[PDB]
Amino acid sequence: VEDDKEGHLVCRIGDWLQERYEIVGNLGEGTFGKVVECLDHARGKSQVALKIIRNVGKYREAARLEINVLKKIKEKDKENKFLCVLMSDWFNFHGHMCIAFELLGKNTFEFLKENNFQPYPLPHVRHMAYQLCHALRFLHENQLTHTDLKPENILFVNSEFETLYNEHKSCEEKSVKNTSIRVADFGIVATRHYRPPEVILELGWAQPCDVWSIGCILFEYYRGFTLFQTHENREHLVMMEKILGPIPSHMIHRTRKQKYFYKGGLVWDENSSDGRYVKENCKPLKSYMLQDSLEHVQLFDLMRRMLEFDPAQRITLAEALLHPFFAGLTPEERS
Ligand SMILES: CC(C)(C)c1cc(NC(=O)Nc2cccc(-c3c[nH]c4ncnc(N5CCOCC5)c34)c2)n(-c2ccc3ncccc3c2)n1
């Protein structure tokens, strides 16, 4: 046991925790501390993720809050059946709160990056979407809101793939063998590209925030690239307007950030570097359909309804789980 003045724990591959956890790898780091891989010698050689949070205090406090959140998700989920990440253990170790999870596979972003940003096929989209909706419905019902939904926070149970590619000129694609996912959270709300306009405009958010993000995420699974490829609010709102249509007067009246607008409209210099990028790449949403086909149109219908500007007219996760799009699930996918 040795601590540095930043507080954090100095651990080495081969160190043991709770006489059952043998560190074998490294999986992450962040504000709060490390995230290592162990084999659980108690539960018999099997593999876990272990977020370590040492001293600091706010860290320890927030770790407790996380554990509680995850405790409550288990209690409220009997059969594991709501597709959130599952805490298998937690403990206290010379001040360092630790939280063990079953080790899942690559997240939906990584997998996409490993596939050279070749989009997932429409059935995978459909299945992943169904589970994201189910999962966040369950969370919303228990007065919980993710707020930082994004592809990196969706993990595949198993990210093994069957590489398969013929005929297509440069066919070289990986289909993941099993599209089951789990929702995690690594820990202005949201990440830029998944952030909804009410957060951008500082109008307060609630559950409808998660739906907007889901909307954004589905698009990315479907095209391989992000729907809003930008890093600044004004551009982002302009992009919203050209992809989706105008912004309700009512949301412009309530913005205290009265800098992006002028006389009811977004200030926007159509002929700049930013101007040209938007002009030569942002087209109306429907135009990004890859095929002229019912299930693709169903998907864009759910997507448009998920990306309503007004959080109050935006579809709920309950209403989406009943959207025709989800007719095409295999019966097995249905659970
Ligand atoms: C259920 C919900 C809502 C989605 C959630 C999940 C988590 N925690 C989490 O995902 N933790 C976590 C932390 C570290 C690893 C993994 C993880 C679980 N399997 C894995 N299988 C493989 N790799 C993993 N990753 C390692 C790299 O890195 C991403 C996950 C993992 C998961 N939280 C959460 C998080 C932080 C909080 N802070 C304060 C208050 C409340 C908090 C709640 N809420």
Author numbering: 136 to 322, 334 to 481
Tell me, in the authors' exact words, what the paper reports.
Increased kinase activity of leucine-rich repeat kinase 2 (LRRK2) is associated with Parkinson’s disease (PD). Here, to our knowledge, we present the first type II kinase inhibitors that target LRRK2. We designed these inhibitors with a combinatorial chemistry approach fusing selective LRRK2 type I and promiscuous type II inhibitors using iterative cycles of synthesis supported by structural biology and activity testing. Type II inhibitors stabilize the inactive/open kinase conformation, reaching into the far back pocket of the kinase active site and disrupting a critical salt-bridge by releasing the regulatory αC helix.
The initial compound 28 obtained from this chemical series, named RN129, outperformed all previously designed and tested hybrid type II inhibitors both in stabilizing LRRK2KW and in inhibiting LRRK2 kinase activity (IC50 = 59.7 nM). Unfortunately, RN129 (28) was not only, by far, the most potent LRRK2 inhibitor designed using our hybridization approach, but also the most promiscuous one, showing high thermal stabilization of 49% of the kinases screened. To elucidate the binding mode of RN129 (28) and to inform future design strategies, we obtained a co-crystal structure of RN129 (28) with one of its potent off-targets, CDC-like kinase 3 (CLK3), a kinase that has been crystallized routinely in our group. Our structure revealed that RN129 (28) has a canonical type II binding mode that has not been described for CLK3 previously. As expected, the 7H-pyrrolo[2,3-d]pyrimidine moiety of RN129 (28) formed two hydrogen bonds with the hinge of CLK3. The linking phenyl ring formed a π-π interaction with the phenylalanine F236. The urea was located between the αC helix and the DFG motif, with the bulky tail of the molecule extending into the far back pocket. The hinge of CLK3 contains a leucine residue (L238) that is also present in LRRK2, whereas most human kinases have larger phenylalanine or tyrosine residues at this position.
